[PDB]
C-alpha cells in the first residue's frame, strides 16, 4: 500500500488475531504454543510433498 | 477493503466516466508517507500487571512512552482509558516497565 514499514512479527501476528476477532492477549500469553503449532503445520506440508 | 481491487493506497472513493465502448474509473486512494523510526513494546508492566493498548501502539520517542494509532503518527500519554489490562507481567515476551496515568485519583487531589 505504500512504502515497507518494518514491524516486530509477533507484533504483526497481534494485529493480525485483532482482524479476525480475538484479543492480542491471547497471542501474547500463548505465543510459544502459536510458533510450535505453526512450526510442526510447515512441517507436515513438505512431508507430504 | 478488497486490496487492489481500488487502486494503489487505501481506497477512500471512485469516480465513473464513459469512453467509447468502455469505462474509466477515477480511484482515490490515501497514501502514507514520511515515517520515522520508533522504538516499541507489546505490553507495559505497572503494579505487576500487564496493559495493552485498546487500539494503537506503544512506541518510544528515545525517552518516553505514548499511544499512536497505527496509521498517523498522533502520541498520547498512557493512561487507564487508553489501554486494558489482562495477567501480570511475567509471560509476555518483550513487556517493559513505565507509568500508566489513572485520571480520577489526581482529580480527587
Ligand atoms: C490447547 O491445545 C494444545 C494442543 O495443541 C495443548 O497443548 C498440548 O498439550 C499436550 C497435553 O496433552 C502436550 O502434550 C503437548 O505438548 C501440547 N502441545 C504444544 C504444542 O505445546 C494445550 O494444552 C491446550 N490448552 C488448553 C488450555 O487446553
Ligand atoms: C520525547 O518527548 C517528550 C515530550 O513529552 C520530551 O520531553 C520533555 O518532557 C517535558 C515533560 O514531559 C516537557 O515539558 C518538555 O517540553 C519535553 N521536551 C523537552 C525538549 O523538554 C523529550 O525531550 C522527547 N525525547 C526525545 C529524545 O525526543
Ligand atoms: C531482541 O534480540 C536481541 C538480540 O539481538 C535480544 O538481546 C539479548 O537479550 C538477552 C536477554 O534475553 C541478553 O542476554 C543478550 O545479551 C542480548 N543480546 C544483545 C546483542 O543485546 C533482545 O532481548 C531481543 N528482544 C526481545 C523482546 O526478545
Ligand atoms: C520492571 O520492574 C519490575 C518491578 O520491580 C522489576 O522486577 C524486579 O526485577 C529484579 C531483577 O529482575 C528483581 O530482583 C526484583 O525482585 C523484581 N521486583 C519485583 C517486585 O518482582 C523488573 O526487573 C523491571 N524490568 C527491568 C527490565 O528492569
Ligand atoms: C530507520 O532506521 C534504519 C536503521 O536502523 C534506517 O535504515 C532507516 O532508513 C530509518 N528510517 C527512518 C524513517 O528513519
Known amino acids: 500500500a505504500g512504502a515497507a514499514l518494518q514491524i516486530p512479527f509477533a507484533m504483526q501476528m497481534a494485529y493480525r488475531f485483532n482482524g479476525i476477532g480475538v484479543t492480542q492477549n491471547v497471542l501474547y500469553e500463548n505465543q510459544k504454543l502459536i510458533a510450535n503449532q505453526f512450526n510442526s503445520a510447515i512441517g507436515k506440508i513438505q512431508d507430504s510433498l | ?109
Not at chain 2, 43 to 59: M, Q, S
Open chain 2, 1 to 109: 477493503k478488497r486490496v487492489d481491487f481500488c487502486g494503489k493506497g487505501y481506497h477512500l472513493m471512485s469516480f465513473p466516466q464513459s469512453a467509447p465502448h468502455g469505462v474509466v474509473f477515477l480511484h482515490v486512494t490515501y497514501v502514507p508517507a514520511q515515517e520515522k523510526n520508533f522504538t516499541t513494546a507489546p505490553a507495559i508492566c505497572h503494579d505487576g500487571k500487564a496493559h495493552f493498548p485498546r487500539e494503537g501502539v506503544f512506541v518510544s520517542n528515545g525517552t518516553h512512552w505514548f499511544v499512536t494509532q497505527r496509521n498517523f503518527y498522533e502520541p498520547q500519554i498512557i493512561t487507564t482509558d487508553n489501554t486494558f489490562v489482562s495477567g501480570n507481567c511475567d509471560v509476555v515476551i518483550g513487556i517493559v516497565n513505565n507509568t500508566v496515568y489513572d485520571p480520577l485519583q489526581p482529580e480527587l487531589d
